[PDB]
Amino acid sequence: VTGPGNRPLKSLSDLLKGKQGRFRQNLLGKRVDYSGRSVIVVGPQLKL
Amino acid sequence: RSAEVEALEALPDTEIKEALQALPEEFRMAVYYADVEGFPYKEIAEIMDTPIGTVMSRLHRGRRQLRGLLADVAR
Amino acid sequence: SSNNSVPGAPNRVSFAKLREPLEVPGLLDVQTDSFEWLIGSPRWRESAAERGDVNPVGGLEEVLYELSPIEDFSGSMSLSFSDPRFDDVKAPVDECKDKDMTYAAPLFVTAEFINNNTGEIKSQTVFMGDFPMMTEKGTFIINGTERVVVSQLVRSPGVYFDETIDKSTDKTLHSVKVIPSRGAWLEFDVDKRDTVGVRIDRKRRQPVTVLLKALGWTSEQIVERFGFSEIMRSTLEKDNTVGTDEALLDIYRKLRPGEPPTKESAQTLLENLFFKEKRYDLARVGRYKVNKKLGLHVGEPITSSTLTEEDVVATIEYLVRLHEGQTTMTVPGGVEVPVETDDIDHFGNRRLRTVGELIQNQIRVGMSRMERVVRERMTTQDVEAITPQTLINIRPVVAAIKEFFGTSQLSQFMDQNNPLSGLTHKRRLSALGPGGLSRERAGLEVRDVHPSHYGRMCPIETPEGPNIGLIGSLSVYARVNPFGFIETPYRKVVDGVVSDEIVYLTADEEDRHVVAQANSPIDADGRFVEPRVLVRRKAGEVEYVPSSEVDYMDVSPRQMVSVATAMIPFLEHDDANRALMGANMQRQAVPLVRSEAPLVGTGMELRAAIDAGDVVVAEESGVIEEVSADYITVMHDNGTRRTYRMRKFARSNHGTCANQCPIVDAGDRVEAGQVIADGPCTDDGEMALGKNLLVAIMPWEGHNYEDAIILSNRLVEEDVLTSIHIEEHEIDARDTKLGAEEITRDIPNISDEVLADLDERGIVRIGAEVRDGDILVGKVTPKGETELTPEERLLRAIFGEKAREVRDTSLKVPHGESGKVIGIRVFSREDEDELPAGVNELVRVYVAQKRKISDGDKLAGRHGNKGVIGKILPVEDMPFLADGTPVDIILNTHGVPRRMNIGQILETHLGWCAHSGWKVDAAKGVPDWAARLPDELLEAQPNAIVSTPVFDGAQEAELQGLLSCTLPNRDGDVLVDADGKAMLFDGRSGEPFPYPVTVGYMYIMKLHHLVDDKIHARSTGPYSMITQQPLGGKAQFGGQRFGEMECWAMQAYGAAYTLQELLTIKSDDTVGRVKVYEAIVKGENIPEPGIPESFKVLLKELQSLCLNVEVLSSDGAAIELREGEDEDLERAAANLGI
RNA sequence: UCACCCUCGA
DNA sequence: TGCATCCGTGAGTCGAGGGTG
DNA sequence: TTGTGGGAGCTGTCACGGATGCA
């Protein structure tokens, strides 16, 4: 069943299936609090 | 609405708190039930075991004393 | 040398050893030619006469001729569109981009209606719609955003044969597809068992004899033509039915499911699908392809473009004879056709639809829907009341054009970091899109460089990621055929001499001839001195052949190269990986506050800059009358004024600032075509994507280890790599269910100090400096009072607050972002402005920031040498030359040799030679090394500009020679020896470094990847309302996804509590998140995790699938998974002092 | 915030 | 009622920005 | 609730195990 634009509607099964389904995307791994990211530059000054 | 906002929303104002603590407990409970919880006056009289006159007198007197207690008005 | 074809262009002395017989065409012609064809502009008119295609017919004119006439089912009344015409543009480009409009012009047609019954004629002029128009820069403006239509790579119509080996058995089965420009496909295949069948519209393969007898052929007639083929005889022996009308009826039942078969409707549908010009469009390109492939009609019969029964006979005979594979084949009327399978990736069989054809293909669909509406009107309406105005409904055409320019994959957000990015974006060729192959259909074999891409598509410039091989830049000298093919110029070689006659060749015409190379020895008259030269074979395989057999020769080196790739000096010294990275990284460079043209370059900077469109050029020869920072007014010899307004601090699509600065003074005499004012990355007319830096090639204390980069602090203090970054903020006040929002300075519970930078409107004031969290636009929103605070309802009930119950929705500055408010524009519903429904006011605040170079910022050269800045040392710590000049950038040595980009080293050597200048000694001179190329490159003043054209750049001997005659400095010292190296002093201890280090001048670009953009941090933030996990993205203040493989790693460590904490109390535990924040705030221990809410969502999703899921106790039954609401009341009533 | 698509980054 | 054929499943991770439905 | 009237795109993907379904 195609909505306007002929894209297939996400069904109740599509919510579970795939790497973007509940299991893969929302259960096996998730986004967390107290987390950041940035570009890494070398520091030779540091201890291991 | 983060967990930070949700955790700070739980804490009291500690300004309206103090002003209410200054009110007489008899008038404080009256202004609480009739204003915070918004009971009808007869039902507030039923809850406090006191007649209608006592309830409404404590109500308006505590209203006035609280009005005199706080001038912040959200600044 | 001079490159004097462009007036006023700076003198860049060229090492080129070969003359350029042909000049780079208009780099945007791929776009302007297409659109001027679509319209029919007089520029396109004149062009056609020259082309010899005397019959000139525009694209809109073509759609009109295909649509006209529109006949009713009775044939009593017809409606024919005749003439397309364009009224002037509605609004200028700047106004369109400001008001979020579409740059468009009204489209009119002459719709003539004729009633045959009463024999009356009614002409008219009908308004079709507001047609989006292409700019002079080759772009479009859609809803206020600039966009480009990428030329799509699609297979041309025709018949295509392929040899499918790898059936169940090792047996070659040959297949053929007849693919039109529009209609139903045709497919002929052969099976594992020997048969021939027609697979029509994905239906089951019926024997081809069914179609043969359905077109009127009889067994005695078809057995004759295919008699030499026993496979056809075997298929007729295995035939199910033999007859004409029953073949029609069986073709019918194959086309028709669930409905009764009939012979009359069989004939009608079978004749309507293919030979009728309505439902079947055989392209003119398609008719040409099939008439060249099958040779049936070569006597110029282009009168009709449709399948001929002879071409289907020819296709079937070709298919069956291809199993034998005899070279010469003759159709009953055909001409000595060679029998061979077709290459799908060859650029003779793979055309491109430019912007004009894509717009035409959307217009065609819209107009066909309008024709349906016309036919519907022709019945219900009262005759003698209709007009061509009442029959035409232009809604579907407008919807089609809007849908195209908004949602089409080929309409792409214009990429403008610098002029070069937009220039190549307009010349990109994309293989993905509607009508072409999908993304899952893209195999390794379509992405590889095809030998037909030589001189047509650049093999170096292509994405590194998943789009590799799917997006490619058009070559420099290539142009698009009217049929949609890509042609490349060559030089006609007669009697072994090379003339100035240039012949453009397509991939088809090219393989018949053997092409020489651009690098070739030439007699002073013109002839090959070498015995056998290397050439590209028809097969494309390289070989050797004498000079009398060479038909054509390359017009120039870089013929195969795109614009961005041909700007890499010493490209031939770099591997295709790093050359690809350099070409792709040039167009990622930001503009700098002032642009410095590269000391060492190619000849492409000037031309690429002026064709890119971000530079101001004089349209007519004249003298400057006035020059201001705002505009430049020139007075022609005509006496006519012409003025050019300067784009000043205008934000580009990607945030890079696009300033324009005049390069001329009042009273200067400018010739037509000269550069009047520079753009963002242009310098005196040439592309300048970076700066010329003093580079030292040596490992320095590990701060440049593993591709990092060490910078001199000068580049901060002197603003060498400083760039201006503008960003737009937008906020609108609208109507909610509780009322309307208001943009006002009146913000409840807010200090006067933070509001100090706001005017009376609540909008920030121009010129103020904004910090993270500063209010840009004050906006209040009516509060529903359902979430109103109990302690606040105390206030509202005791003090009797009546009028205003609102909350603060004001726009604030995002994290990590700060700058100076440049401009503010505002639209009000109280005034006359077009705003979406419910939206009262809409205000945009522009904020610019001056970003110095910094740790983490990304620098890269033209040779694919990238890196971030590990450390910026003070000017004293930097190793300095003998005269005390500290080097600007230290590039690690270990990165050069393995990556096969040594063009950077030669660039460094020639850059020092150009910085210090040189004087080659010429007393009994003309030394054998300098004799070959150098013409007046003998001496050059310091900081000269020179060019090394790709594949014609300075040879190694000449660079080694220049390294010796380097002019000394002001003190008479030669600081860089003939090895290109120099003695450096450690600026920290003071001792000189023991060995000489290569120093020189390298062109370094600041790519658009900066720490100010990429740094992100989140302790707590917004969550998605469905799964309750933290959001994602820096814009949304999201968290980092701890993915599946990260959990694998965490488990491999055996760290259970870390994995649980990451997955429960940090992400999905609704009661655990606030518990953790509260516990840390009060300095207590962290509590025990709960249940992930997304698991509850999973259980509900399974229950919605009719799966009864229940969580069982240890020994008990199902456990209640939700919580009662009475847990939260105790602490609230206590905080209110019960 | 939801879903697509596009172009990018390692 | 033995076997070809057609159908369903699968095809790396993590980031950024834009547009439109 | 008249008299008229046959869709848009695709496929230029590959490998593998199993149930379907044909003859």
Curated annotation (Swiss-Prot), chain A:
Relate the induction remark in this record. Answer: 6-fold repressed by starvation.
Q: How does it assemble?
A: The RNAP catalytic core consists of 2 alpha, 1 beta, 1 beta' and 1 omega subunit. When a sigma factor is associated with the core the holoenzyme is formed, which can initiate transcription.
What role does this protein play?
A: DNA-dependent RNA polymerase catalyzes the transcription of DNA into RNA using the four ribonucleoside triphosphates as substrates.
Q: Which family does it belong to?
A: Belongs to the RNA polymerase beta' chain family.
Q: What protein name does the entry list?
A: DNA-directed RNA polymerase subunit beta'
Q: Which gene encodes it?
A: rpoC
Please give the range of the full-length protein represented by this chain. Answer: 391 to 438 of 1316
UniProtKB/Swiss-Prot annotation, chain B:
Q: Which residue intervals make up region (Sigma-70 factor domain-4)? A: 15-66
- Say which domain of life the source belongs to: Bacteria
Gene deletion effect: Increased susceptibility to oxidative stress (H(2)O(2), cumene hydroperoxide and diamide, PubMed:12123450) and heat shock (45 and 52 degrees Celsius). Loss of stress-induced expression of a number of genes including clpB, dnaK, sigE and trxB, sigB and itself. No effect on infection of human derived macrophages, and murine J774.1 activated and unactivated macrophages.
Concerning PTM, the database record says: Phosphorylated, possibly on 2 residues, probably by PknB. Phosphorylation of SigH has no effect on interaction with RshA.
Which ranges form a coiled coil?
none
DNA-binding residue intervals? 41-60
Q: What induces it?
A: Poorly expressed in exponential phase; induced by heat shock (20-fold, 45 degrees Celsius). Induced 10-fold by the thiol-oxidative agent diamide within 30 minutes of exposure, by 2 hours expression is again normal. Autoregulates its own expression, part of the sigH-rshA operon.
Entry domain remark: The sigma-70 factor domain-2 mediates sequence-specific interaction with the -10 element in promoter DNA, and plays an important role in melting the double-stranded DNA and the formation of the transcription bubble. The sigma-70 factor domain-2 mediates interaction with the RNA polymerase subunits RpoB and RpoC.
State the family named in the UniProt similarity comment for this chain: Belongs to the sigma-70 factor family. ECF subfamily.
Kindly state the subunit structure of this protein: Interacts transiently with the RNA polymerase catalytic core formed by RpoA, RpoB, RpoC and RpoZ (2 alpha, 1 beta, 1 beta' and 1 omega subunit) to form the RNA polymerase holoenzyme that can initiate transcription. Interacts (affinity=15 nM) 1:1 (via sigma-70 factor domain-4) with RshA under reducing conditions; the complex is disrupted as temperatures rise. Phosphorylation of RshA decreases its interaction with SigH, leading to increased SigH-mediated transcription.
Give the protein's recorded name: ECF RNA polymerase sigma factor SigH
Swiss-Prot record, chain C:
**Keyword field:** Antibiotic resistance, DNA-directed RNA polymerase, Nucleotidyltransferase, Transcription, Transferase
Q: What is the effect of changing H425L?
A: In strain: SP28; rifampicin-resistant
GO biological process terms, semicolon-separated: DNA-templated transcription; response to antibiotic
> What PROSITE patterns does the entry give?
RNA_POL_BETA
UniProt-reported outcome of changing L432P: In strain: vr12 and SP22; rifampicin-resistant
Query: In UniProt terms, what is the effect of altering H425P?
Result: In strain: vr8; rifampicin-resistant
Impact of changing I121A on the protein? Weakens interaction with TRCF and CarD
**What does the record say mutating H425D does?**
In strain: vr5; rifampicin-resistant
Report the EC code(s) recorded for this entry: 2.7.7.6
Fetch the InterPro entries from UniProt. Answer: DNA-dir_RNA_pol_bsu_ext_1_sf, DNA-dir_RNA_pol_bsu_external_1, DNA-dir_RNA_pol_su2, DNA-dir_RNAP_su2_dom, DNA-dir_RNAP_su2_hyb_sf, RNA_pol_bsu_bac, RNA_pol_bsu_CS, RNA_pol_bsu_protrusion
What superkingdom does the record give? Bacteria
An example Gene Ontology CC term for this record: DNA-directed RNA polymerase complex
Q: What happens on changing S411T? A: In strain: vr3; rifampicin-resistant
Q: Which GO terms describe its molecular function?
A: DNA binding; DNA-directed RNA polymerase activity; ribonucleoside binding
Q: What is the catalytic activity of this protein?
A: RNA(n) + a ribonucleoside 5'-triphosphate = RNA(n+1) + diphosphate
Q: What does this protein do?
A: DNA-dependent RNA polymerase catalyzes the transcription of DNA into RNA using the four ribonucleoside triphosphates as substrates.
On subunit structure and binding partners, the annotation says: The RNAP catalytic core consists of 2 alpha, 1 beta, 1 beta' and 1 omega subunit. When a sigma factor is associated with the core the holoenzyme is formed, which can initiate transcription. Interacts with CarD, TRCF (Mfd) and RbpA.
The record's family statement is:
Belongs to the RNA polymerase beta chain family.
| Classification via NCBIfam families | PRK00405.1, rpoB
Protein name per its UniProtKB record? DNA-directed RNA polymerase subunit beta
Q: Which organism is it from?
A: Mycobacterium tuberculosis (strain ATCC 25618 / H37Rv)
Gene that produces this protein: rpoB
